[PDB]
Amino acid sequence: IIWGAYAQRNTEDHPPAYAPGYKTSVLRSPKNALISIAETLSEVTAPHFSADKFGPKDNDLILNYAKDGLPIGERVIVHGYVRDQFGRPVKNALVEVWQANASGRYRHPNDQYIGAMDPNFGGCGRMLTDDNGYYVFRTIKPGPYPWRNRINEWRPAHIHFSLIADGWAQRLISQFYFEGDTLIDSCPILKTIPSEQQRRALIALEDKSNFIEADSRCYRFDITLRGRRATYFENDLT
């Protein structure tokens, strides 16, 4: 098996750069169209991170910052699989997540929301996918976050995530939401995605058989990255 380039990104499956309803994008979106290039070794390669450097609680947002006690909020486990567009598992990909606490408050200098800070919650974690492309982390469900777009804008509860996998072309940052949240229908940020089926691809599903009795609930969320094509005739990559 000789690998060729990643399949082209389907721009219609993603938000456009200029999206007037999300006001900050107006001045931070290029006026010129992106220039598409044919891929080289630069685009199909990516770094490797070693499992040895990860701490034991790096995927446990409930405990990795707990000092005097446990954080306040809903205990939830999130898991799923990362695969490429042709369905192949993405192994040893670096998954990083960040979020607000149960009050909808971020532990960030620039967040002045009145929702209370939790001295026992940090809000960031990371993990590597396994050989099946599986990942799992535990956290506190974040509360919805009010922000200034229109004056009374509110983000649905959400968790930010980032993936660095096999090729630089697969680099991706996004956010997932929780099944049933009514703010999902009103969010200008989620509405920058043009199609309904794609907005639904960011909603984590309640996974009731995987709840742990008298302990935690569970959400299932899978992620799809760009996939590489195989070459059977000329190999122009190099």
Partner 1 sequence: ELKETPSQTGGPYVHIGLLPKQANIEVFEHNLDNNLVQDNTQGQRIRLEGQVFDGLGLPLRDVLIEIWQADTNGVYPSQADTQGKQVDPNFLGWGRTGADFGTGFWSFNTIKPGAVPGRKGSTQAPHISLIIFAHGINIGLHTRVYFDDEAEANAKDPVLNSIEWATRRQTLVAKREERDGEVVYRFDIRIQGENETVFFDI
Of the candidate spans 71-79, 85-93, 112-120, 129-137, the one that interacts with partner 1 by CB under 8 A turns out to be: 85-93
Q: Output phi, psi for 220, to 5 deg.
A: -110, 130
- 159/142 Cα distance (integer angstroms): 7
| Beta carbon of residue 49, minimum distance to a copy of itself (angstroms, whole number) | 20
48 marked as part of a ligand binding site: no
72 vs 91 by CB, closer to partner 1? 91
Q: Do residues 218 and 205 make contact, with C-beta atoms less than 8 angstroms apart?
A: no
Which two structure tokens, joined as six digits, stand for 166?
Answer: 């096999």
Site string for partner 1, 142-181 (x = CB under 8 A): --------xx--------x-x-x-xxxx-xxxxx------
158 is catalytic: yes
Q: Pick from 146, 175, 222, 224: which binds a copy of itself (CB under 8 A)?
A: 146
Which two structure tokens, joined as six digits, stand for 182?
Answer: 């009514």
Which two structure tokens, joined as six digits, stand for 77?
Answer: 């486990």
Q: Pick from 75, 81, 96, 183: which binds partner 1 (CB under 8 A)?
A: 96
Which two structure tokens, joined as six digits, stand for 227?
Answer: 């996939």
Q: Pick from 41, 53, 213, 238: which binds a copy of itself (CB under 8 A)?
A: 213
Residues 156-175 binding a copy of itself (CB under 8 A) are: none
- 69/213 Cα distance (integer angstroms): 21
Q: Do residues 30 and 16 make contact, with C-beta atoms less than 8 angstroms apart?
A: no
